[PDB]
Design a protein around this nucleic acid. Structure first.
Ligand SMILES: [Mg+2]
Ligand SMILES: [Mg+2]
Ligand SMILES: [Mg+2]
Ligand SMILES: [Mg+2]
Ligand SMILES: [Mg+2]
Ligand SMILES: [Mg+2]
Ligand SMILES: [Mg+2]
Ligand SMILES: [Mg+2]
Lengths: 238, 196, 115
RNA sequence: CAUCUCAGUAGGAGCGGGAAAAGAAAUCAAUUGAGAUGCCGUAAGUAACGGCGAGUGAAACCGGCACAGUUCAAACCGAA
RNA sequence: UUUACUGCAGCCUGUCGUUGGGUUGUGACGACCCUAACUCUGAGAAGAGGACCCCGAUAGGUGGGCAGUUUG
């Protein structure tokens, strides 16, 4: 049994591949609101979230539930946050996308109603509300897909704070090492051609090469699906 | 046909898909799925089946519903060298039937009783529910009961785990006699497990 | 089925009481089914709180095709008490009305009328 | 050497007593018989299985040790 | 190690079961609609999917991911 890949070790859940969950400030999600209910709240401070390398806003609501929130760009201290359908379409507000005008930017979008926010959460990403229909609504996601979402799926208006984070080159292996200390990722990573044949499909040989096509099928078993997984195409744009 | 009402219950449960038991099945499986693995009940779901199997309306007898997963003994692929006939395990269902599995789980949860019998009560895609009858061998009523006082003997403690119940004896190939039981009776272990 | 009037149910309960005082009554689903099959059921009272439902689910069509009128009582505690016992009784059968025969036959007439 | 054999062995999990399991035919026979079960001898390296290769492989009849037959569900009665 | 031999996991897909109700187009097949099982979310009100998916079994494929062997 040639040795299991790094993905199989990660899936097993060993301490090398586990996230340092105690380092993070708090799970980010929209506040729980009953149907046809609303709550107000004010920002008490902009903190730093190690899980995302972006700011998060500490919001104190009207029922006294101090809840960490994902910070859209421009949110400040002493700003009022509103939730519900009756909430005004304003930056930093949590509203359904069915009330948002088409062409606006939203983030922390919910896959389902009362979801807590799944899509559009990285530092600086945003979504565009494309079309409104009775049962649906189209949102142009940061990837580019025109995802169709429920009209009641909440989202905070504005782009996510911390835009431009990847503009700085890393410039040094220590800087990326210090980022990866607070991450779950393994750093540094050895190339598979440098491995022995027991460790990787691509390892071994008198000279560094895979010896087999790097585009692997989608029907490959675990421990074989490496390289270019199920590629539609390869190479730079000719 | 002056038939007891137990006969009418048995008639209703003979072909449960085309009786009133189908409506009760759709209304009952919702409650049954929410319950635990081993759930105690007031009265048996099929009273005639329990009475013919040995249930009596007296203290010291307990009836419990057990949920067991459907399918065979799910087994692990071996990680070491096998001779290609001992390497495949998807198409292998073990020698332990689901009725024996349910009886053993009922015996596990109820350590001070003994498993008397059990019977099929319902099923869906993922589960089979069995109602297992248990007896209290230290209650005084069962001690006085001459048709249940055999269970106080030392050889009766651990019936469902030594394969002595009716599903157990069926699983040990002792439902019949004569030809075919040359390697099962008196025990699977006696013939080096060649029978079964 | 049309829901029976509450006064008819009360009259059936008092008829069961008077039958217990004077005539013959078969209390229990087994004895009720035997009395229905044999052809003696002057009146059949059923409990609506049976669990499991298979205990008295056969009583309806059996009594209907055996020409014995049946009534549905709300639950079995007062059926058991009215039938002379301190426990439940999922059904009682009246086979000898005694001094309450006329009230039983009027109950049968009302049941067939609202049937 | 892969079916096979090694072998249901080695090992594992559960249960359990001075023994345990088995046990009173929906049996074995053959043209007509026997009459619970276990264990011993024999049937016999026979039937049967098998790259019909290597090997694996019974039971019944029969002769013995020992001898044991019964209790529920139900019909009918109805708290007896 | 592999386009050696024989297989086994994983994955893909038909059929049966789980699995219900009404509509059209055909002679049981395909699609459509519904909530009521079922699934997911929430502490729950409830919200979203929904007879699909998951799951049990079976049939075929892919399959050095893994196993046993051979390579006189
Ligand atoms: Mg390899
Ligand atoms: Mg358990
Ligand atoms: Mg014994
Ligand atoms: Mg012990
Ligand atoms: Mg026995
Ligand atoms: Mg052998
Ligand atoms: Mg190999
Ligand atoms: Mg070998």
């Amino acid at each position: 049994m040639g040795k299991r890949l790094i993905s199989q070790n990660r899936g097993r859940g060993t301490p090398t591949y586990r996230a340092p969950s105690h380092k993070y400030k708090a799970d980010l999600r929209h506040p729980r609101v009953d149907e046809n209910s609303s709550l107000r709240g004010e920002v008490v401070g902009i903190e730093h979230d190690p899980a995302r390398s972006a700011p998060i806003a500490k919001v104190a609501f009207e029922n006294g539930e101090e809840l960490f929130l994902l910070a859209s760009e421009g949110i400040a201290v002493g700003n009022i946050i509103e939730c519900g359908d009756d909430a005004e379409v304003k930056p930093g507000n949590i509203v359904p996308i069915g009330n948002v005008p088409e062409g606006f930017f939203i983030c922390n979008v919910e896959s389902k109603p009362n979801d807590g926010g799944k899509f559009v959460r990285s530092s600086g990403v945003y979504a565009t509300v494309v079309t409104h229909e009775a049962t649906r609504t189209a949102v142009s996601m940061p990837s580019g897909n025109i995802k169709w979402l429920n009209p009641k799926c909440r989202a905070v208006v504005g782009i996510v704070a911390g835009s431009g984070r990847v503009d700085r080159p890393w410039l040094k292996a220590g800087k990326k090492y210090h980022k990866m200390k607070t991450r779950a990722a393994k750093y540094p990573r050895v190339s598979a051609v440098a491995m022995n044949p027991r460790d990787h499909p691509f390892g071994g040989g008198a000279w560094k090469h895979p010896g087999k096509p790097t585009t692997v099928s989608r029907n490959a078993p675990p421990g074989r699906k490496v390289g270019l997984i199920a590629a539609r195409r390869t190479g730079m744009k000719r | 046909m002056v038939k007891s009402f137990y006969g009418y219950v048995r008639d209703a449960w003979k072909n449960p898909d085309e009786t009133y038991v189908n409506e009760l099945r759709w209304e009952r499986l919702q409650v049954w799925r929410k319950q635990g693995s081993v759930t105690r009940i007031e009265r048996p779901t099929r009273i005639d089946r329990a009475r013919s199997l040995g249930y009596k309306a007296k203290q010291g007898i307990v009836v419990v519903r057990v949920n067991v997963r459907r399918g065979g003994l799910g087994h692990v692929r071996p990680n070491r060298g096998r001779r290609t006939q001992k390497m495949g395990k998807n198409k292998v269902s073990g020698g332990m039937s689901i009725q024996r599995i349910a009886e053993v789980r009922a015996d596990r949860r109820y350590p001070n009783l003994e498993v008397l019998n059990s019977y099929w009560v319902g099923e869906d895609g993922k589960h089979k529910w069995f109602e297992v009858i248990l007896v209290d061998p230290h209650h005084p009523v069962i001690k006085s009961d001459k048709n249940l006082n055999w269970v106080c003997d030392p050889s009766s403690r651990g019936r469902a785990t030594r394969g002595k119940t009716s599903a157990g004896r069926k699983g040990r190939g002792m439902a019949t006699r004569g030809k075919g039981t040359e390697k099962t009776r008196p025990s699977i272990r006696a013939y080096k497990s060649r029978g079964k | 089925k049309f829901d029976v009037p509450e006064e008819l149910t009360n009259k059936a309960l008092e008829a069961l009481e008077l039958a217990r005082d004077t005539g013959k009554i078969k209390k229990g689903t087994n004895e009720a089914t035997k009395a229905i099959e044999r052809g003696n059921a002057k009146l059949v009272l059923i409990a609506e709180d049976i669990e499991p439902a298979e205990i008295v689910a056969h009583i309806g069509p059996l009594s209907e095709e055996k020409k014995a009128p049946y009534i549905f009582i709300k639950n079995q505690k007062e059926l058991g008490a009215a039938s002379g016992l301190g426990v439940s009784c999922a059904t009682v059968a009246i086979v000898d009305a005694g001094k309450a025969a006329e009230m039983v036959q009027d109950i049968a007439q009302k049941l067939e009328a609202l049937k």
